[PDB]
């Protein structure tokens, strides 16, 4: 029935350790056959999220295989027992491409370190959004990152009215979901970032306190600046950074107290593998650490809660969902690279509009 | 008024690692003031307990000061609003003393590296043991380490029947508890023990493999007998040891799987104090990573479920719990000693009859 042109970033050269987006992708032309089996849809990218946790999927990727990541799609054709229908908007796993093939079935991510299966497509409906709630709110707020924080805040921590709550990596969009849920209800929130301008962001959101990550390099210095900030212990801690930081916050857990494991960015991107041992620590505590693997939480009820709880908050900006969107396909790999290497002027989420 | 002759094993050095008791320990002749205020009772020693967290307390203890430990004491004399009459029996950290004066009611631990607060005396009733389940178990199945064993696997861990368990540490009472309620309820029971003959007393018990930790004496020897052990993975750990079994086991942790802290041997003894970071591999699994102080149970209504549910299994027989009882005060320190350097013929709890 046909082809079309289209456009692909795909993964030219592994490169351990903090990216260099420039030499590891690679944008190729690629002619993509149309005609469609028949659950299979042929897809147009609206947008693309670029994330942390791409560094890893990317050391993963076969040599010259497309660079996966969320996106929202729109579906141009459709075979007879497609999931979905042209015109449909969906979000799921389609990668920086311009365009797609897929039947939207889940999808076992065959070379990763870990089995991780990736989600079945997810329909979105237009009338959920508004100026205030826009469609691209579908790989923020009420997308992935908005699951995470509000699954790890309503169905494994407790906030407590007088909980002392630390947040390290709490510029992005998930830390800031934490630190607000956290104070509205009664905690004080503690957050680290990365620059006197994030830390005044962070501040007017509800932030009582902000420590520059990048002066308390050590965890001598972090354990300083935390016994500042949270001078009654930490009562619970999202954890997106590991490393020195997470060393400290072990040293002052309350009775009691809960860790969420979102990320581990010391390790992943530094390469800081060794440390002191940790779990010496959390036995007088009672402490309970969880690690976070949000895809556990992609149900429908779960999506229509999100929905229900955060979206009100947040269209009076209340709970306050920023987002940085730049524009252009040919910009996806520096979108990325800000992440790592110049994220002062990065607000919310990050994506890419094509 | 009056004073009596007693005896108790003091604290002589400061050693860390392996403690040299005869070398830590010096038992000398105490005149105590057997005047007692409204509240306090002069108690007389029956048993006392060694322990392998007695480590760590000696350490915290003044020179010059009596060893502490947990022991069943007499009452001979109480003063008007004492809690407990003459003749009647307490459990509580009377130490390693043939007599003394204690109103029985909590006490902060002043030089403890944490705060932790000495539970209230708990009075012990006769009707609850007999030749199956004698006195001494106060202090053993029957006490805390029955406790922290019956509390972790009842309120925390959630063994399902075709988990694997794992248990570092089995071969002492805590273990071989945890392993034989993991098998009770349906689980693949892999321990680690010190030599082929307490291996196979593990078998005995119900274990399905034991892994020598003698010989698999790094991550890498202990990451390829786990393995063997464990070919589908470890979805519930027991932890008393730490160290490289422990990293070990959270390199194949399962999704949804659980881990209780309940000692780390290969810190607080061996001084391992750095290794590679674990959280950055609980994510993907989900790990749930809980402290065990098991203070916090110390309820009469756990106490009573505890007589209840463990002690009926003991006295129908489907569960053994192993006691190592040494005769005469002045062999507390001998018995301590062998938890750590001739464990061979210690099964279970070892404590010292008075
Ligand atoms: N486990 C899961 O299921 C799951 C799900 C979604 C996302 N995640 C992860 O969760 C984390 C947060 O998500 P997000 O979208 O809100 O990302 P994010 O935190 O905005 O990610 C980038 C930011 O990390 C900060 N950063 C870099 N090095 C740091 C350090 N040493 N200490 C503290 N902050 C540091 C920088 O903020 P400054 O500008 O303040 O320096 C940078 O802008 C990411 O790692 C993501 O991969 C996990
Ligand atoms: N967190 C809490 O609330 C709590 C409460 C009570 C007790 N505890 C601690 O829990 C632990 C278990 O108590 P327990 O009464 O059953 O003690 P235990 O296990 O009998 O302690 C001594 C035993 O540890 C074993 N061991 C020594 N080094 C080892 C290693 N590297 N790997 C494996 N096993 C090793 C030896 O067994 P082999 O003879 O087989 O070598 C020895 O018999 C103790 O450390 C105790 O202090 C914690
Ligand atoms: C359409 C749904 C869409 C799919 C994408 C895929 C992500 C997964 C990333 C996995 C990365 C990975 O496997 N690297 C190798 C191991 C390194 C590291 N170790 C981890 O355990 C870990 C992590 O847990 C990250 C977890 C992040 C989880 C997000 O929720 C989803 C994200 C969601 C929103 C790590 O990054
Ligand atoms: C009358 C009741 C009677 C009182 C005794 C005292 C124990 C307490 C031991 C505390 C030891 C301690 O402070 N060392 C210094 C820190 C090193 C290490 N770090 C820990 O976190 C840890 C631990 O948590 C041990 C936990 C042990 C829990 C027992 O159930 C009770 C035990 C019960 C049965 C350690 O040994």
Same mark, same amino acid.
């Given at each position: 029935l046909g082809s079309m042109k289209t456009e692909r970033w795909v993964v030219r050269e592994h490169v351990e350790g903090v990216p260099d987006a420039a030499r590891i992708?690679?944008?190729?032309?690629?002619?993509l056959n149309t005609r469609l089996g028949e659950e299979q849809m042929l897809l147009k990218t609206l947008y693309v999220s670029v994330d942390p946790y791409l560094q890893g999927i990317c050391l993963d990727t076969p040599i010259g295989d497309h660079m996966g990541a *969320?996106?929202?799609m729109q579906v141009l054709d459709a075979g007879p027992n497609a999931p979905f229908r042209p015109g449909d908007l969906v979000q799921g796993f389609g990668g920086w491409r311009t365009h797609l093939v897929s039947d939207g079935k889940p999808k076992l991510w065959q070379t990763g370190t870990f089995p991780m299966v990736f989600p079945a497509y997810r329909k979105l409906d237009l009338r959920h959004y508004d100026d205030a709630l826009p469609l691209s709110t579908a790989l923020g707020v009420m997308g992935g990152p908005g699951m995470t924080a509000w699954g790890t805040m309503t169905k494994f921590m407790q906030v407590r009215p007088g909980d002392t709550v630390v947040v390290s990596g709490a510029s992005g969009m998930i830390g800031t979901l934490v630190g607000q849920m956290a104070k509205r209800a009664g905690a004080r929130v503690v957050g680290t970032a990365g620059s006197a301008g994030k830390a005044r962001?962070?501040?007017q959101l509800?932030? *009582?306190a902000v420590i520059d990550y990048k002066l308390a390099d050590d965890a001598d210095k972090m354990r300083e600046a935390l016994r500042e900030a949270?001078?009654?212990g930490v009562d619970k801690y999202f954890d997106s950074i590991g490393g020195s930081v997470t060393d400290a916050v072990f040293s002052m857990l309350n009775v009691g107290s809960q860790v969420a494991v979102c990320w581990q960015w010391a390790?992943?991107?530094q390469?800081?593998?060794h440390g002191p041992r940790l779990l010496p620590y959390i036995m007088f505590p009672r402490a309970t650490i969880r690690?976070?693997?949000?895809?556990e939480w992609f149900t429908e009820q779960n999506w229509s809660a999100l929905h229900e709880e955060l979206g009100g908050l947040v269209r009076r900006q209340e709970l306050v969902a920023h987002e940085t969107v730049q524009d252009g396909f040919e910009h996806i790999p520096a979108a990325y690279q800000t992440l790592f290497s110049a994220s002062e002027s990065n607000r919310g989420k990050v994506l890419v509009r094509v």
């Open positions: 992708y690679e944008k190729v032309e690629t002619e *969320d996106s929202i962001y962070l501040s509800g932030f *009582d949270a001078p009654d390790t992943q991107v390469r800081d593998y690690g976070i693997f949000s895809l």
